[PDB]
Design brief:
part of a larger assembly, 2 chains, A: mainly beta, Immunoglobulin-like, five-stranded antiparallel beta sheet, two-stranded antiparallel sheet, about 0% helix, globular, B: little secondary structure, about 10% strand, Spike protein S1 (chain B)
Chain lengths: ~130, ~50
């Protein structure tokens, strides 16, 4: 069973530089391509970010044109989400997921991801 | 509805690579022309210096 868990959540003003942590035990996190998710309150599940195993490609959704970047930690097989320039509409709990073997390419569906984590409740205030 | 009940358009490419005329190809870019300077020359037919 994969102990997929996330941490690093607190209230902050717009533009605070805060990070995430995808923890993956059990299966492989080194080879898989993965994505990040949230359950917006009053809305539906929407995509956050994605990466391939060796960080040779990235992809994101429409409203994250300059606020997001996806990069990998190799010591604990974690993927960061260095995010800044916050908007008060971004409050949600962030979930990193799991995919089958990917050679190269980007996918964003909330349900395309077989496994989901515990999450981190990110929040924004003016 | 949710993303789980909204239509997804899908087109998937299948590549028929078998030895034959192979008339489909990607575009090839050209370097600008130099004159009177010893240069490596590359052309579709052959390369050389």
């Amino acid at each position: 069973q994969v102990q997929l868990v996330e941490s690093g959540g607190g209230l902050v003003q717009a533009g605070g530089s805060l990070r995430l942590s995808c923890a993956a035990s059990g299966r492989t996190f080194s080879s898989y391509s993965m994505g990040w998710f949230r359950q917006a309150q009053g809305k539906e599940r929407e995509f956050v970010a994605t990466i391939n195993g060796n960080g040779r490609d990235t992809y994101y959704t429409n409203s994250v044109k300059g606020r997001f970047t996806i990069s990998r930690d190799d010591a604990t097989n974690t993927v960061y989400l260095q995010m800044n320039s916050l908007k008060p509409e971004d409050t949600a709990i962030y979930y990193c997921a799991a995919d089958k073997d990917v050679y190269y390419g980007y996918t964003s569906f909330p349900n395309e991801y077989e496994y989901w984590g515990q999450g981190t409740q990110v929040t924004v205030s003016s | 509805n949710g993303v789980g009940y909204q239509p997804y358009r899908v087109v998937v490419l299948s590549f028929e690579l078998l030895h034959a005329p192979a008339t489909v190809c990607g575009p090839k870019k050209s370097t600008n022309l130099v004159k009177n300077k010893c240069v490596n020359f590359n052309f579709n037919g052959l390369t050389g210096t």
